[PDB]
């Protein structure tokens, strides 16, 4: 169950208060895949991270009884001076898991990453592919009711995308996704219902095709302004 | 499990303490050498500069223990200011897991500094006892109370500076530059009794002088204190600073996340 | 000095209550 | 741990205790100050001697024999903190006297003020 | 001083227990 | 001295106004 | 185009940029660099006026303070500002006419011009207040000031080259610039310290330079033994040699 | 003082071991 009550989110600017969210009240459907898509810069990412709990809402709150993952591919989330192993150890110590279970998790993520020699190297020297790989492997390590993807699938080379898709379809069935992507085929392939977030309000569509059609209609309306 | 907020607070504090100890002591634990080298160098320089002067000043107390008792608490206070103030930018990328509020970084750095200087203090008294000096306080729990007051004042000042100078990463250098004359004026190297009285009341504005004198008085037997030195003034300074720091943190809680 | 002591005590416990309430709110902020 | 419990157990209770002590239970204490100096007739050592001898024990023996200090200081039964409990030890009596008589030194003039 | 020494003993024994608990926790995590 | 104490009262009143406004803002955000 | 002409061009442009960023957006730094000697003088006179009057009854305290303070302010600025010039323009090293030594020289010339303006203004207001403000032997003053300038610039370049990495060490030198204030004869005349502490203070070249500048400034000013100019001259020459050597050797790794 | 001398020698010998081991490990 996901419920949103009286959400208000903004940030101070020199030209006034650029308000993004203002008193949003809405209930999400359960056991179905959500394709969250909206105008770029109109509030998709802040909605994602308040769903992820990174920034708590200034007004109102969200209520849930399931587990929602932090945004995958969170390269800036891990601290630089620590190694990949140390960052993983820190992350499992955050969630307070047992010793042997967390050992199983670090072995799993080092098996997935296959970095090897640089796995015990601090991550300021890492390239983007390696940090994305350990982020994906770490996010796939925890058993979670819902997963948050900020268009982190199409990035990377073919082989990494291949095993990423493999472990992903290993995780479907027992878990559900929220897709934030600019590739429409991903929402028609991995989503059941579609929400549209325009100008500070979200509208539901039980049909994915109706949702993407309304997306193109909103884009045409934006392009039609003289 | 529901995992009540005290439990997750313990978990994030424990993990963050590991993370911060991994870098404060340095890779391969090279920093502990400097950690116990710095008081030794301070002791050596000050003793071969001022041993005869201190002997002529007050002959009842030998110089090295009088140096240690005012040096190690000030080192703890200086750590609790400078190390604590820069606790925001060092973990700025860590603020994306919803249980990583910056007060956890502040508390982790404070507890790490407290533990490190506690072991350094115990080692220092052990060495002083091993060399035949006087090394047991006569009023131990009063010393503990003054040490706790100094610790909480330093932690409050560190939190206040970390909150205030967040948008402005600078003025930290000015904080250290201002901390140096605080070392040179709080009577941690020479007894304050020889200071001419016309400078005396202004020097009483510094609460660290009061805390150092009160910690020294409860340590040595028959150590006189000057008029105008009390516990109420540094205690009130510490309480007001802690209230101001917590209130300022509560105002700008959301702004410390990027 | 009855009234001076009473005023000093009022200020002290007001500050103490404010500090402990801020600490309680700070720990209560974690809502996993 | 609601706010009501914190206010009741941190603000209202200690102020209530202090109010019912300092208003209806405390005992008044009058001070009688004096300013003295010792000089040679036609001096820091003699004023140190006086400062030590005022807080001494033999002076207490003489004064307790003379002016009956113990039974005077046990008179106020309403205030339990500043009164002198009967049957107390000699060392407690000495510390109580040292608390009651306050001696300050003006080193610029070498003047002893006794309150 | 019986009770006074007991109080200071409590304070010291606690402090060293906290410090050694921290050091045993980090040496358990390291290895 | 009429004018001398007025400046001190102005300064202390401004300080009290500032600190009371800041704590009122604190308790309003709470 | 000769290398010298393009060197003037790049130094001019870098001076313009660094003068824009040194002061505030609406020139708030000029107020601070005018007020800092004023605050230092206020504190120092109000704390040691009678003591300095008792020290020697021939030199007024404010002129002594100015003559010992403004050269030290220039030296401290040259040391502490020259070493941040590497990290301020990391991304600028991509136009093939810009080298790190150009940033070094631009920062140094600005530090020199600003402190010379401050010195002239301070001497003007000192003469305006009825004090003594004409150096008796100005040529030796210029020579000692040039030696001090070259020593400070050399030390700044040396610290800029050595501490390109480990920026924490950068911070450290600013801390060590604080006791250097309190020892090199800036506050109090050095004739009053007990004599057995003398030679330990005589390895500091800034003390010698300050003493010689004050001696060439005032008429009939007494210097101690071993306050020769040869020791600061040799220190400055050796420091400049080592700094230029280390910049030449470690030249290519100062890239983007 | 036999026991005192043995104890202070032990402490210094361990310290020496600690510093030489740390530098010989960090050179690698
Ligand atoms: C005792 C003399 C006078 C009294 C001064 C008392 C000091 C004030 C109290 C400390 C004020 C303060 O803020 O601390 C200062 C310490 O004072 C100094 O600089 C000493 C100056 C020496 C030059 C003097 C020449 C005189 C000129 C005559 C011609 C910076 O040190 P810090 O401990 O804070 O640095 C810790 C950082 O977090 C990390 O730096 C490292 C680290 O651990 O990675 C790296 C590196 O090794 C070094 O920077 C560092 C360390 O090891 C190297 O001493 O540790």
Task: Beginning with the edge strand found earlier in the chain, give each strand of the sheet holding A16-28 in spatial order.
Answer: A16-28, A2-13, A59-64
Q: CB-based burial of residue B237 (10 Å sphere; 0-12 exposed, 13-18 middle, 19+ buried)? A: buried
In whole angstroms, give the CA distance from residue G69 to residue G149.
Answer: 14
Which chains reach chain C with 3 or more Cβ–Cβ distances below 8 angstroms?
A: B, D
In whole angstroms, give the CA distance from residue B12 to residue A96.
Answer: 9
For the CA of B42, the nearest atom of ligand 1: 1
Residue A128 annotated as binding site: yes
Q: CB-based burial of residue G71 (10 Å sphere; 0-12 exposed, 13-18 middle, 19+ buried)? A: buried
Q: Are A57 and A49 in contact, with CB atoms under 8 Å apart?
A: no
CB contact under 8 A, B246 and C19: yes
How far is G178 from chain B, CA to nearest CA, in Å?
7
With CA atoms as reference, the chain C residue closest to D25 would be C2
Pairing of strands A176-179, A146-149: parallel
Q: Are B63 and B55 in contact, with CB atoms under 8 Å apart?
A: yes
- Give the H or E element holding residue A196: strand A193-198
Closest CA to A141 of A95, A179, A186, A173: A95
CB contact under 8 A, B251 and F25: yes
For the CA of G166, the nearest atom of ligand 1: 45
Give residue D104's region: left, alpha or beta (phi > 0; psi -120 to 50): beta
Whether residue D7 lies within 8 A of chain C, CB to CB, comes out as: yes
Q: A38 in helix, strand or coil?
A: strand
Task: List Cβ<8 Å contacts ≥24 apart for D11-15.
Answer: D11/C13, D11/C14, D11/C17, D14/C9, D14/C13, D15/C6, D15/C9, D15/C10, D15/C13
Residue A192 annotated as binding site: no
Q: What is the rounded radius of gyration, in angstroms, for the C-alpha atoms of chain A?
A: 19
Pairing of strands A193-198, D111-114: unpaired
Residue A41 annotated as binding site: yes
CB contact under 8 A, H22 and B130: no
For the CA of B46, the nearest atom of ligand 1: 1
In whole angstroms, give the CA distance from residue G201 to residue B219.
Answer: 36
Whether residue B254 lies within 8 A of chain H, CB to CB, comes out as: no
Q: CB-based burial of residue G22 (10 Å sphere; 0-12 exposed, 13-18 middle, 19+ buried)? A: middle
Instruction: Give residues with Cβ within 8 angstroms of G26, minimum separation 6.
Output: none
C-alpha to C-alpha distances, B115 to B13, B26, B110, B111, G200, nearest whole angstrom: 14, 16, 9, 6, 38
With CA atoms as reference, the chain B residue closest to E7 would be B141
CB contact under 8 A, D15 and C20: no
**Closest CA to ligand 1's atom 9:** B180
CA H14 from centroid of its chain's CA atoms: 2
Which residue of G72, G76, G168 sits with most ligand 1 atoms within 8 Å of its CB, as the best mutation to test the pocket? G168
Whether residue B2 lies within 8 A of chain A, CB to CB, comes out as: no
With CA atoms as reference, the chain B residue closest to A87 would be B19
C:1-32 residues touching chain B, CB 8 A cutoff: 12, 15-16, 18-19, 22-23, 25-32
3-class DSSP string for chain D: CCHHHHHHHHHHHHHHHHHHHHCCCCCCCCCCCEEECCCCCCCHHHHHHHHHHHCCCHHHHHHHHHHCHHHHHCCCCCCCCCCCCCCCCHHHHHHHHHHHCCEEEECCCCEEEEC
CB contact under 8 A, H26 and B33: no
Residue A137 annotated as binding site: no
Tell me the count of A-B CB pairs closer than 8 A: 56
DSSP letter for B24, please.
H
Chain F residues with CB under 8 Å of B250 CB are: 26, 29-30
For the CA of B180, the nearest atom of ligand 1: 8
Task: Give the method used.
Answer: cryo-EM
Helices (H), C1-32: 2-28
Chains E and B touch (3+ CB pairs under 8 A): yes
CB contact under 8 A, A94 and B15: yes
CB contact under 8 A, F30 and B247: no
Task: List Cβ<8 Å contacts ≥24 apart for B56-59.
Answer: B57/B190, B57/B191, B57/B193, B57/B194, B58/B191, B58/B193
Q: Which residues line ligand 1 (CB under 6 A)?
A: B 26, 31, 34, 42, 45, 78, 82, 176, 179-180, 183; G 168-169, 172, 175-176, 179-180, 204
- Give the H or E element holding residue B201: helix B200-203
Pairing of strands A201-205, A176-179: unpaired
In whole angstroms, give the CA distance from residue A137 to residue A131.
Answer: 10
**Closest CA to ligand 1's atom 8:** B180
Distance G172 CA to ligand 1 centre (A): 6
Q: CB-based burial of residue C20 (10 Å sphere; 0-12 exposed, 13-18 middle, 19+ buried)? A: middle
Chains A and H touch (3+ CB pairs under 8 A): no
In whole angstroms, give the CA distance from residue G99 to residue G10.
Answer: 9
Residues F3-25, buried b or exposed e (16+ Cβ, 10 A)? Answer: eeeeeeeeeeeeeeeeeeeeeee
Distance G174 CA to ligand 1 centre (A): 10
10 Å Cβ neighbour count for D8?
A: 12
Q: Are G9 and G99 in contact, with CB atoms under 8 Å apart?
A: no
Residue A125 annotated as binding site: yes
CB contact under 8 A, C13 and D3: no
Q: Resolution, rounded to a tenth of an Å?
A: 3.4
In whole angstroms, give the CA distance from residue G178 to residue G201.
Answer: 15
């Amino acid at each position: 169950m996901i419920e949103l009550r009286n959400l208000t989110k903004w940030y101070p600017t020199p030209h006034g208060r650029r308000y993004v969210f203002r008193n949003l009240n809405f209930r999400f459907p359960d056991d179905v895949s959500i394709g969250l898509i909206g105008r770029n810069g109109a509030g998709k990412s802040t909605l994602m991270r308040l769903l992820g709990g990174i920034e708590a809402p200034n007004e109102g709150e969200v209520v849930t009884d399931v587990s929602i993952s932090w945004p995958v591919g969170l390269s800036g989330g891990f601290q630089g001076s620590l190694t990949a192993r140390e960052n993983v150890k820190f992350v499992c110590r955050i969630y307070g898991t047992s010793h042997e279970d967390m050992l199983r998790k670090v072995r799993f993520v080092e098996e997935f990453a296959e970095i090897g020699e640089h796995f015990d190297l601090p991550m300021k020297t890492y390239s983007s592919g390696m940090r994305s790989r350990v982020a994906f492997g770490l996010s796939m390590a925890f058993d979670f009711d819902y997963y948050l993807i900020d268009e982190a699938m199409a990035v990377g080379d073919a082989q990494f995308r291949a095993k990423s898709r493999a472990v992903f379809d290993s995780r479907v069935g027992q878990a559900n996704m929220i897709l934030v992507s600019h590739n429409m085929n991903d929402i028609k392939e991995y989503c059941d219902v579609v929400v549209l977030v325009d100008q500070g309000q979200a509208t539901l569509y039980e049909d994915v095709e109706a949702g993407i059609a309304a997306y193109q209609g909103s884009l045409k309306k934006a392009a039609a302004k003289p | 499990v529901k995992r009540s907020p005290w439990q997750i607070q313990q978990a994030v504090l424990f993990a963050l303490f590991l993370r911060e100890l991994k870098t404060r002591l340095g890779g391969r634990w090279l920093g502990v050498f400097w950690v116990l080298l710095e008081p030794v160098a301070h002791i050596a320089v000050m003793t071969t500069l001022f041993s005869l002067a201190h002997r002529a000043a007050m002959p009842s107390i030998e110089y090295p223990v009088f140096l240690i008792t005012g040096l190690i608490p000030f080192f703890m206070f200086r750590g609790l200011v400078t190390r604590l103030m820069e606790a925001i930018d060092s973990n700025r990328g860590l603020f994306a897991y919803r249980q990583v509020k910056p007060i956890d970084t502040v508390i982790a750095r404070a507890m790490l500094e407290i533990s490190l200087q506690s072991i350094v203090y115990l080692i220092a008294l052990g060495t002083l006892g091993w060399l035949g000096f006087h090394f047991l306080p006569v009023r131990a729990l009063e010393l503990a109370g003054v040490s706790a007051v100094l610790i909480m004042l330093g932690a409050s000042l560190g939190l206040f500076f970390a909150v205030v100078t967040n948008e402005i990463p600078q003025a930290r250098a000015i904080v250290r530059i201002s901390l140096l004359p605080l070392y040179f004026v709080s009577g941690v190297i020479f007894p304050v009794h020889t200071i001419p009285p016309q400078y005396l009341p202004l020097l009483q504005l510094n609460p660290v002088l009061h805390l150092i004198e009160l910690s020294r008085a409860s340590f040595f037997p028959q150590y006189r204190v000057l008029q105008g030195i009390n516990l109420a003034y540094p205690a009130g300074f510490a309480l007001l600073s802690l209230f101001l720091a917590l209130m300022l943190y509560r105002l700008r809680r959301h702004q410390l996340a990027s | 000095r009855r009234w001076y002591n009473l005023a000093t005590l009022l200020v002290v416990c007001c500050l103490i209550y404010g500090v402990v309430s801020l600490v309680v709110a700070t720990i209560r902020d974690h809502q996993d | 741990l609601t706010a009501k419990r914190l206010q009741w157990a941190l603000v209202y209770l200690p102020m209530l205790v202090a109010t019912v002590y300092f208003l209806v239970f405390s005992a008044d204490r009058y001070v009688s100050e004096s300013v003295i100096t010792v000089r040679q007739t036609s001096s820091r050592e003699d004023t140190c001697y006086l400062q030590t001898y005022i807080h001494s024990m033999g002076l207490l023996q003489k004064l307790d024999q003379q002016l009956k200090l113990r039974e005077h200081f046990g008179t106020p039964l309403r205030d339990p903190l500043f009164r002198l409990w009967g049957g107390t030890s000699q060392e407690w009596f000495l510390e109580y006297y040292r608390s009651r008589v306050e001696v300050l030194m003006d080193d610029i003039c070498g003047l002893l003020t006794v309150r």
